[model samples]
Target: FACKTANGTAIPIGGGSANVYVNLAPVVNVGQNLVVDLSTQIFCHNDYPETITDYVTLQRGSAYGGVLSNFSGTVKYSGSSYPFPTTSETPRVVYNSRTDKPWPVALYLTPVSSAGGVAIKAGSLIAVLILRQTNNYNSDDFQFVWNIYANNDVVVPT
Candidate 1:
């Protein structure tokens, strides 16, 4: 599906935008079971049946000794488009956000693998969270935050 120029010549390579929203919302502790729903959706490149990876960072706030733990799995990834659609696709991931994690950084996922392969029309979310024992249900810790959303890099022309 490569677009061509007015001269009938194929456009130069590596111009297509990498439309990863990389939006890891700043969470405010609201419950004991701190869970987060995430979505991953990036258009395809020039490869067929490409492989997309999920990256994230459980950033540690200024609060000291505020550990994070007791995590579960992904909840959904039904649609992978702009306004995700209504589909029947339940995806899951191995969650890691525990106390043992470095106080300021419980996690730093570099290549979080998506359960299934790349899905542009199917988005998923795993319950990622922070666990501070007494303040387990509290979310008043960090002041600075920046975590990448699920990055979907797939091959097009499939």
Candidate 2:
């Protein structure tokens, strides 16, 4: 199926094997607020529904990585929104649906400091979405990668 705006701008709708992706350009600058709205959907048999867990990993390419902190995000699933853990010390479960499921997730990130143990410069970056399932009759894990660009574009005054 196809989704489009009144003027013809396209909106992404989910269909295919289990997958996760963001439709908008994923780029931001230091101290700039970043919001990534993404979605994941998969086909499931009624008898083989499984719980799904989601995770995001940031791999910084620039020389300054430690200076980038104060990360946060939210997951919207099954008609409710839940806070995604700022740090990955614990499992960040985004959704738990067994049937053919589609869920929305929004990631918010901002650089809190320019001066820190490690200097923060903007450059290439990568964010990976790790999706997993438990006790599913089919395959169990899915990994999706998004290329990110962090530059000195415009930082919101904070």
Candidate 3:
């Protein structure tokens, strides 16, 4: 999985643990909106027989000194037609703070029928994070420590 700008510049996310920072300076500006696409290139060799749900959390770490508003998320499928319906939760701040609190988002892929699971495809736009920068700050002032979890376990993309 990866997080990138609309034009495709990679935004580095730390690997190996739940605590990782995502630098937003590459595409962030005061009073401007920012869109980040979260995509995946993982393919299931065998059919996944159950609904797949993924969780993403963005923590407002100590280094972040900027304000973000209208933070939200939208889910996307691979193509015009898919075997299942994709849904997602609006990104919401779990607690109001600039420290330990986090904004959590969830993506769900549910099969239409109970017959079997669908084949997961690669290179799909899984979800998008949208928000507006409400204040100004230094290049390093908007670091977001984040984590991605699959089935409640933290996942570190290789």
Candidate 4:
């Protein structure tokens, strides 16, 4: 899986083996909305169906001492052309902004099919997110994290 800007600029993944992070370029101004796309590709060798759950989290880091608001998301899939046979769930966004910890915007996604499973495909657009930047510092850097869970753990991005 991968994340990219709305215009299709790939967000490079960085961090050590344990932690993964993506940095947003061309710093966005305050109150500006950013559009991002999450895409994936699947190749299946077996006939059995597969289910996947994706958790996308956006958290503010120390460098980017800013706030995010108005989180929204949309799931994208074509009925007959998608990799899996089952219809996926509608993407949902949750915002948590308590005083205790840093604010976080979470998006939940599940892509799968019902009729056994679907065929393999390339460059499948899974979801789209719109985030409004409430604040921005001189060195603004945020965390765009993803946790994908699947049976047998067969999916891994190259």
Best of the candidates, TM-score: 2
What digit string (tens of lDDT, one per residue) describes model 2 on residues 34-104? 55544332222222224334332221111113223433344343344444432332233333333433323
Q: For residues 17-42, what per-residue lDDT tens digits would candidate 1 score against the true structure?
A: 11112222233122222222322221
Candidate 4, residue 77: the lDDT equals: 27
Candidate 3 lDDT tens digits, 1-158: 12332222333422222222222222222233322223331111111113322223232211111111112222332222211112322232222222221222323222212212112212222222331111121222123323321112111111
Task: Return the top candidate by lDDT.
Answer: 2
Candidate 2, superposed: residue stretches over 4 Å from native: 1-32, 40-103, 115-123, 138-158
The list of candidate 1 runs beyond 4 A from truth reads 1-21, 32-40, 44-71, 79-158
Prediction RMSDs, each to the true structure:
20.7, 9.3, 19.5, 19.8
Tell me the TM-score of each prediction against the true structure: 0.19, 0.36, 0.24, 0.20
- In angstroms, give how far residue 87 of model 2 lies from its true place: 4.5
Number of clashes found in candidate 1: 13
Error of 1 at 147 (Å): 11
lDDT of each: 0.22, 0.33, 0.24, 0.23
Residues forming the 10-long window of minimal summed lDDT in candidate 4: 61-70
RMSD of 4: 19.8
